[PDB]
Scaffold this active site. Sequence first.
Site, mmCIF file in Angstrom:
data_model
loop_
_atom_site.group_PDB
_atom_site.id
_atom_site.type_symbol
_atom_site.label_atom_id
_atom_site.label_comp_id
_atom_site.label_asym_id
_atom_site.label_seq_id
_atom_site.Cartn_x
_atom_site.Cartn_y
_atom_site.Cartn_z
ATOM 1 N N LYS A 92 0.802 -1.205 0.000
ATOM 2 C CA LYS A 92 0.000 0.000 0.000
ATOM 3 C C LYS A 92 0.837 1.258 0.000
ATOM 4 O O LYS A 92 0.282 2.352 0.076
ATOM 5 C CB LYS A 92 -0.963 0.006 1.184
ATOM 6 C CG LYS A 92 -0.295 0.071 2.488
ATOM 7 C CD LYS A 92 -1.269 0.062 3.590
ATOM 8 C CE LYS A 92 -0.535 0.237 4.869
ATOM 9 N NZ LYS A 92 0.375 -0.899 5.088
ATOM 10 N N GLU A 96 5.640 6.982 8.999
ATOM 11 C CA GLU A 96 6.195 6.068 8.020
ATOM 12 C C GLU A 96 7.714 6.075 8.077
ATOM 13 O O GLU A 96 8.315 6.655 8.973
ATOM 14 C CB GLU A 96 5.669 6.429 6.643
ATOM 15 C CG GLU A 96 4.360 5.785 6.380
ATOM 16 C CD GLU A 96 4.388 4.337 6.750
ATOM 17 O OE1 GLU A 96 5.111 3.581 6.071
ATOM 18 O OE2 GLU A 96 3.706 3.954 7.720
ATOM 19 N N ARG A 97 8.340 5.396 7.128
ATOM 20 C CA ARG A 97 9.789 5.332 7.110
ATOM 21 C C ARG A 97 10.371 6.657 6.653
ATOM 22 O O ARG A 97 9.832 7.313 5.763
ATOM 23 C CB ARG A 97 10.260 4.215 6.191
ATOM 24 C CG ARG A 97 9.744 2.860 6.533
ATOM 25 C CD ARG A 97 10.047 1.935 5.415
ATOM 26 N NE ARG A 97 9.808 0.551 5.758
ATOM 27 C CZ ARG A 97 8.654 -0.063 5.571
ATOM 28 N NH1 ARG A 97 7.633 0.594 5.062
ATOM 29 N NH2 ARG A 97 8.510 -1.329 5.901
HETATM 30 N N1 ADP Z 1 2.880 -3.213 -6.817
HETATM 31 C C1 ADP Z 1 3.806 -4.084 -6.427
HETATM 32 N N2 ADP Z 1 4.384 -4.880 -7.358
HETATM 33 C C2 ADP Z 1 5.316 -5.756 -6.959
HETATM 34 N N3 ADP Z 1 5.790 -5.982 -5.738
HETATM 35 C C3 ADP Z 1 5.201 -5.181 -4.836
HETATM 36 C C4 ADP Z 1 4.229 -4.233 -5.093
HETATM 37 N N4 ADP Z 1 3.854 -3.594 -3.919
HETATM 38 C C5 ADP Z 1 4.591 -4.157 -2.994
HETATM 39 N N5 ADP Z 1 5.431 -5.126 -3.481
HETATM 40 C C6 ADP Z 1 6.371 -5.931 -2.712
HETATM 41 O O1 ADP Z 1 5.972 -5.915 -1.361
HETATM 42 C C7 ADP Z 1 6.800 -4.994 -0.603
HETATM 43 C C8 ADP Z 1 5.911 -4.052 0.170
HETATM 44 O O2 ADP Z 1 5.629 -2.883 -0.641
HETATM 45 P P1 ADP Z 1 5.078 -1.563 0.085
HETATM 46 O O3 ADP Z 1 4.175 -0.826 -0.847
HETATM 47 O O4 ADP Z 1 6.221 -0.824 0.698
HETATM 48 O O5 ADP Z 1 4.193 -2.208 1.258
HETATM 49 P P2 ADP Z 1 3.726 -1.661 2.703
HETATM 50 O O6 ADP Z 1 3.904 -0.164 2.660
HETATM 51 O O7 ADP Z 1 2.282 -2.073 2.855
HETATM 52 O O8 ADP Z 1 4.630 -2.328 3.711
HETATM 53 C C9 ADP Z 1 7.739 -4.345 -1.629
HETATM 54 O O9 ADP Z 1 9.023 -4.098 -1.070
HETATM 55 C C10 ADP Z 1 7.801 -5.399 -2.737
HETATM 56 O O10 ADP Z 1 8.741 -6.417 -2.472
HETATM 57 MG MG MG Z 2 4.623 1.501 3.994
#
Ligand code: ADP
Ligand code: MG
Lengths: 32, 140, 520, 193
Positions: free
Chosen positions: C157, C183-184
């Site tokens: 997300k 957040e980070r």
């Molecule tokens: N749209 C996407 N396509 C491919 N891999 C994704 C995608 N979104 C997330 N990921 C994978 O999952 C991880 C979490 O993404 P992120 O958006 O930072 O999630 P959150 O903020 O919910 O922890 C990413 O580092 C990647 O490995």
């Molecule tokens: Mg996040």
Amino acid sequence: ADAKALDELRKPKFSSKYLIQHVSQKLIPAVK
Amino acid sequence: EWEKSYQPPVIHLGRVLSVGDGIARVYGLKSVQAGELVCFDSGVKGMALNLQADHVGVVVFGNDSVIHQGDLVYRTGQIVNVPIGPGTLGRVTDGLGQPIDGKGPLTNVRSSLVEVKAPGIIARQSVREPLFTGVKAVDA
Amino acid sequence: PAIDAGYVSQVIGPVVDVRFDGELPSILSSLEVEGHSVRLVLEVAQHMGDNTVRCIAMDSTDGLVRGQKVVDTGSPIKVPVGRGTLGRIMNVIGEPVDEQGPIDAADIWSIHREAPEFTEQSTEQEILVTGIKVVDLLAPYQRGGKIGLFGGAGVGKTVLIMELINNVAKAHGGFSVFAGVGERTREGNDLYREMIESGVIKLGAERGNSKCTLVYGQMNEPPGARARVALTGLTVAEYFRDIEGQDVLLFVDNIFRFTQANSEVSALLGRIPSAVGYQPTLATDLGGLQERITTTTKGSITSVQAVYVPADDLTDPAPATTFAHLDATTVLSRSIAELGIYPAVDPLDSTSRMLNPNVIGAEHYNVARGVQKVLQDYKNLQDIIAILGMDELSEEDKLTVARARKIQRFLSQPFQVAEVFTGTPGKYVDLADTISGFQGVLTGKYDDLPEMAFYMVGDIKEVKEKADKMAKDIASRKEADNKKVSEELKDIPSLDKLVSEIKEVVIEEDDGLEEDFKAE
Amino acid sequence: LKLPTAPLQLSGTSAQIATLLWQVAAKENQLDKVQDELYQFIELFKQHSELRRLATDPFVPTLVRTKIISSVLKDSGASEITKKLFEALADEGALSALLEVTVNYEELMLAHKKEVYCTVITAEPLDKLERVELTKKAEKFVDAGFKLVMQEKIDKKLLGGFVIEFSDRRVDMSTAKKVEEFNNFVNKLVLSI
Ligand SMILES: Nc1ncnc2c1ncn2[C@@H]1O[C@H](COP(=O)(O)OP(=O)(O)O)[C@@H](O)[C@H]1O
Ligand SMILES: [Mg+2]
């Protein structure tokens, strides 16, 4: 609250006796 | 030059009200800081956690069986710090920076606070260079 | 300096009780602590009753003494707003944290206000095409509505919010406000550098042509700062909506951190806890924050907020209360991400108020309901497929299973912001392309292609391109290995010729650590 | 309304009585009057058991408590603040608080006379010049023109000098801490050199 200031209230410090000798003249009829 | 510049600092006292459940309530220490390292007279340190109106909640870095009601709590004047520097390299320390390997005191070291704010947005840069773990499941 | 200066009565973590000798501050008014290591701003939460107020500190209280004089500003936390805030970074109290000097302030607004009234609300449902297939088909976003991305701990997300920034914000025309709440700090620095490269944030002399304000209250901040930075970003958006009168975008990463930071503070404000461990005033705090993020008659705020779910539980009260404040919900689930389907949007749990046949049309709504019917009919077949096997369904059931496995893969898409860690180019899909392709899979025009033809493609042309790309691959066997490497004449040198070129590095003699520690 | 400000801030609900008792006795300039009047009740509670029954026994009616305190304090020329004080505590049953109001009335009286009770520990008893050296040396530890009131004790384990015990803080100007701090500094400096 403290304790070490409150242990010193076990000592007589009144420096006047116009109440302690008055109240015993009027406490006992009031409680009787 | 040390002896010509020598000031016996006014040690601030404080009795212990109530100890147990790993936390002492400390009467006194009216000038103590929030998060300051306080030192009990048993040699066990503590951290002034909750500054209340009538006492100071001190969490006790160590076994609280050596703390009694009526013990004296001297404040050290600084937020909780550990000795940092190159003199820590090679040394096995406990959670407060005191060495437990028995190799003497930490020489060539300097105290710094354990509760530091992380560097902000403009202080970072992107992660470029790699850190090889030596595990080929990881590094691949 | 006797009156209008109170003293710190007691300090319980991030909660500071300040005692005034008379003429107390109002609730929500900001105070200043005198002689702290950084600027410490307290914000009055309660009147405790005995000329004592109870405040929440916007920075860390480590180093407060119970006698410190606290001056009252006579006003709530007032942050700079205007067009001179564009292309800058602000923290919770409005200070710049980008080292670009002071913020040129068209106004200094308070971060606390009421929601706009009933008569200022505007009921206009126009769609926002995002380029994401599952979003444009099954839960379309309102242009001027509140959008929520639900999911917990690595479902995607933030990559969804960055793809929404990359698609919507670059083709918007109005201003944007990114409010990073809890957040980070790595992600905020990544967004700041990526927005400098894209020209969305310009530095220096051409700064006023920037299109974004960042307000960052990231997860290294004490719980007073994360509980109030969403209000600062909301105020920067509210100025553009009310005063400048234009359409803005508000991206709030993890609005759950506002709820969590109030839940951390409220344990020390001396309250009985509510359900799972949260504060009793959860719904009203969240409501009073969210009811300011609206489209009014004077402007628009398109709000995209990511919502974290704790322990992947949607019945947790902080997501379950957020569900009511949002027009479009996008629930990202962990199991769909473990299937490889990215964006991991649950199509049977994400909804929209635009999914209405009077808003998006008839064939769009019918295609969306048909895709959801196929997916629900497949979800009802999961147990017997698990324990009896695929080979015991009816023929229409195992046609439904095949079409559902096709439309599950087809809802996935490569993102243009994920092309740095995937390798696939990003695929903006138009809305008509999504409707046409999903109508094609629904009617049965594409029962002939494999399942993996649909995995991570743009639209219905690229499923056929990938089908011939993967059925020329099983025929891809060429002769003689095409060597042209066996003894290349004076193109491949020897090894000691190649070691003769690599430079000698100098190894600096046992780490040099004591010589520069004594430099200080 | 318009009361004189207390000399120092204090705790809750028992010192807040003594702060308010000090704040009205200062407008009457009867600060030393009621401090004498509070002390007389503390010996009075030491004498009679039928009087401290009104503060501990939970079965006396709250009418009989507030009548007896009034029926005793009609007379004797007690200050009208204290006979208004004891009727406030007798209505609320807070007569037990008088032992804690008095110790919180004391340090308000102490910080109004700006005196601070300290304790000097020396190796030998002092001269009359060593005392006037010590008084101006110890006057750098109080924060105003406070009249320091010393007490004198003897510890020969100190090898000369003094310590002050302010009952809040302690300054150790003795030569014993001087030589052990010296030896610590020396043995830590040769730890590096
Ligand atoms: N749209 C996407 N396509 C491919 N891999 C994704 C995608 N979104 C997330 N990921 C994978 O999952 C991880 C979490 O993404 P992120 O958006 O930072 O999630 P959150 O903020 O919910 O922890 C990413 O580092 C990647 O490995
Ligand atoms: Mg996040």
